[PDB]
Design a protein around this ligand. Structure first.
Ligand SMILES: CC(=O)O[C@H](C)C[N+](C)(C)C
Length: 175
């Protein structure tokens, strides 16, 4: 195993990452970058809702990681966290339990501008993992979504946890 437990390394200056979303309302998510856990139950920084790590796209430094309660939290807290990002900031997102109840149109639009295809349709108890970036042009290649649906839900009441891994190119110091 290589960085973050991937089966292959990420060469050419790329950042290795792995995200696992939550399982129902009992197993928290985790976000790994370059073999370091940005968010996990061991770091004790995850919670129900959206678990978001903001990362410098040049250095890979963690700027901040926070969980946002999407059931009872004020969505303006989430919005203040994700709106004023510098160009190239990477945005790692893992849902836990319910990512959607407090999401509003402004939040869906901002995630879309960060590269999300699934934010526009996110609904109660969906599973979602996503890596976006401030200034991305096309949609992100790192996004998975599972709808909360009784026919397919792994759990009584919730969809399965998602696992996503990959290699992210570094931004240059140019500019
Ligand atoms: C700038 C741009 O392009 O962005 C980056 C590459 C990141 N992701 C995550 C989206 C992949």
């Amino acid at each position: 195993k290589y960085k973050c437990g991937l089966p292959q390394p990420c060469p050419e200056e790329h950042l290795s990452f792995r995200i696992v979303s939550g399982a129902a309302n009992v197993i928290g998510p985790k976000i790994c970058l370059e073999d370091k856990m940005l968010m996990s139950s061991v770091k004790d920084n995850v919670g129900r809702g959206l678990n978001i790590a903001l990362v410098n796209g040049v250095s890979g430094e963690l700027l901040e990681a926070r969980a946002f309660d999407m059931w009872a939290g004020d969505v303006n807290d989430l919005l203040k966290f994700i709106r004023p990002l510098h160009e190239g900031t990477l945005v790692f997102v893992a849902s836990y339990d319910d990512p959607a109840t407090k999401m509003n149109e402004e939040t869906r639009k901002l995630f879309s501008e960060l590269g999300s295809r699934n934010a526009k349709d996110l609904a109660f108890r969906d599973s979602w993992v996503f890596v976006g970036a401030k200034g991305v042009q096309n949609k992100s290649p790192f996004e998975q979504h599972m709808k909360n649906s009784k026919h397919t839900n792994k759990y009584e009441g919730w969809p399965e946890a998602l696992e996503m891994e990959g290699c992210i190119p570094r931004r240059s110091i140019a500019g």
